[PDB]
Design a protein around this nucleic acid. Structure first.
Ligand SMILES: [Mg+2]
Ligand SMILES: [Mg+2]
Ligand SMILES: [Mg+2]
Ligand SMILES: [Mg+2]
Ligand SMILES: [Mg+2]
Ligand SMILES: [Mg+2]
Ligand SMILES: [Mg+2]
Ligand SMILES: [Mg+2]
Ligand SMILES: [Mg+2]
Ligand SMILES: [Mg+2]
Ligand SMILES: [Mg+2]
Ligand SMILES: [Mg+2]
Ligand SMILES: [Mg+2]
Ligand SMILES: [Mg+2]
Ligand SMILES: [Mg+2]
Ligand SMILES: [Mg+2]
Ligand SMILES: [Mg+2]
Ligand SMILES: [Mg+2]
Lengths: 155, 73, 115
RNA sequence: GGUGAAAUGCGCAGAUACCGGGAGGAACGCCGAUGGCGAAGGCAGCCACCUGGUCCACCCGUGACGCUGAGGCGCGAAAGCGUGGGGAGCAAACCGGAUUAGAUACCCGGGUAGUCCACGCCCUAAACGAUGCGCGCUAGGUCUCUGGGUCUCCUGGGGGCCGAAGCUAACGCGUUAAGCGCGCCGCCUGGGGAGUACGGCCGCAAGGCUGAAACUCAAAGGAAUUGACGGGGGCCCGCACAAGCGGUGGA
């Protein structure tokens, strides 16, 4: 930007369930546009989750997101002679990305052999409080606090 | 605008040379013992060159304070 | 040691540090603390989060002697000057009155080069 | 404590911060103003005393007594010397620490001279409005300090800003003249060499005053214009950076 803020990309609401969040996740799985893969990657994680902890797979998603959504972050900056890592609060949408971003990024860092599997587990494991998902969330609220020493240079 | 009220109107008449008139000469200091900036007082070009060697008089005779400390108020 | 109801809070805010010595209605050093006692080593010490910290660890040694009320005094304009002032209303201590009394010549000593 | 960050430094013989008392030196916060005064350097905490200049009023007095001044005489910031006091704080030289390629510096922690008083020297300055000194004449407008009056306004003396006429290379001056004229003074006469040398003169000394030439160069300069440029600012834009996706660099 430098002429105004972007309007943010108005996605197709999910074809099956209907959540616009479900969309952005599927794309956020997807690599190289190969979207009919990541749709299956998703809709097999709902076969596993509806059948391993028998409730609504959709509800766990909503929760597996709230639980990785950070609330403070290090919006770094500089004075004139050296630069300070700096605490900053977070936007509504900025959550929703880093949420899904990290949910994936963990699932690939998971050790299992299968695709929709390392989503299924890192979807329960997110909506518990463990797994690599939430670890990082609580890690840049931890570098929000163990670095609170300069919350006067915050913007 | 600092448009409260200058101390020239908030009084009947008086003399600028009667050092111990301390009822009046308290309203020509601040929340420090500092002689009020000519804009606050509203005194003439003569007048606050007089009221200058006045509260410098009525200080040595203890009556009017040299400085204060500060009320957060 | 002893117990004291009313006591008065001294705050000395420099730039390389911020110092809180708390006392009794005379001015007698009950407990004192600055940022450099909290664990801060160099330029670390002057931060407004150090001033918030001294006015904790000093106000904590002072409830140790059962502190009830405080009046505050502050000496200077310095980093996190009022950040400690707040750090005392926020520690669990009635803040009576709050006063500033900065060393103010009437022009006696030629300051160093570095004015 | 100190800095960009840090160490020299001070503190477990008790520092800092903190209360009460005490000594000692140096300056004078707010009023302090684009304000005052003075010939100039220069002068502000408060009191009295010994004094200088100056403006306003009534136009009462002598009756041209007036202007300027070569040389002479006196005053002259700061540092600097001399004898004797004084020494808090600041602080050349100097002692350390840090930065940097190196740092005899910029930054930090100490430090003698010295700044302070005296009494005699020194007598220079970007001593500057860079405009020597008096008088007469030439639209005004606002502001500000200070006087007098029949104080809605009139009229004296100051300090500022904008502008007539006119001057000026241009900038800018502009009834505080760099405008229009009279008197007298000192001063200039191309840049470098050079504020040196020679000589005299002054001072205890550091040095000052007066002040050249040989030779060498076609310049040295003054304002002003369009640009370029800044570790100068003000305001916009590019996937320029950030927010995101994927790679090279390795194989
Ligand atoms: Mg004392
Ligand atoms: Mg002068
Ligand atoms: Mg007559
Ligand atoms: Mg006659
Ligand atoms: Mg003469
Ligand atoms: Mg001298
Ligand atoms: Mg001596
Ligand atoms: Mg030094
Ligand atoms: Mg001497
Ligand atoms: Mg002398
Ligand atoms: Mg002299
Ligand atoms: Mg000379
Ligand atoms: Mg002259
Ligand atoms: Mg005038
Ligand atoms: Mg003209
Ligand atoms: Mg003009
Ligand atoms: Mg020649
Ligand atoms: Mg990028």
């Amino acid at each position: 930007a430098r002429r105004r803020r972007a309007e943010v990309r108005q996605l197709q609401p999910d074809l099956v369930y209907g959540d616009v969040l479900v969309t952005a996740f599927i794309n956020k799985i997807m690599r190289d546009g190969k979207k009919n893969l990541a749709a299956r990657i998703f809709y097999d994680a709902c076969k596993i989750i509806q059948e391993k902890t028998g409730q609504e797979p959709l509800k766990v998603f909503k929760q597996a997101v709230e639980n990785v959504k950070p609330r403070m972050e290090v919006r770094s900056r500089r004075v004139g002679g050296a630069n300070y890592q700096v605490p900053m609060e977070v936007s509504p949408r900025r959550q929703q990305s880093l949420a899904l971003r990290w949910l994936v990024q963990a699932a690939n860092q998971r050790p299992e052999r299968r695709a929709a599997v390392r989503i299924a587990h890192e979807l329960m494991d997110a909506a518990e409080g463990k797994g690599g998902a939430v670890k990082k969330k609580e890690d840049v609220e931890r570098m929000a606090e163990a670095n609170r020493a300069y919350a006067h240079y915050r913007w | 605008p600092s448009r409260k009220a200058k101390v020239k109107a908030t009084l009947g008449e008086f003399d600028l040379r009667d050092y111990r008139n301390v009822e009046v000469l308290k309203r020509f200091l601040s929340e420090t013992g500092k002689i009020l900036p000519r804009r606050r007082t509203g005194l003439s070009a003569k007048e606050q060159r007089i009221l200058a060697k006045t509260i410098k008089r009525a200080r040595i005779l203890g009556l009017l304070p040299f400085t204060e400390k500060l009320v957060r108020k | 040691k002893r117990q004291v109801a009313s006591g008065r809070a001294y705050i000395h805010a420099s730039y390389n540090n911020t110092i809180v010595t708390i006392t009794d209605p005379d001015g007698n050093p009950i407990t004192w603390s600055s940022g450099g006692v909290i664990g801060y080593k160099g330029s670390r010490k002057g931060t407004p989060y150090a001033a918030q910290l001294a006015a904790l660890d000093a106000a904590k040694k002072a409830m140790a002697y059962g502190m009830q009320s405080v009046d505050v005094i502050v000496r200077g304009t310095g980093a996190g000057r009022e950040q400690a002032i707040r750090a005392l209303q926020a520690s669990g201590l009635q803040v009576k009155s709050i006063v500033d009394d900065t060393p103010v010549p009437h022009n006696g000593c030629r300051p160093k080069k570095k004015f």
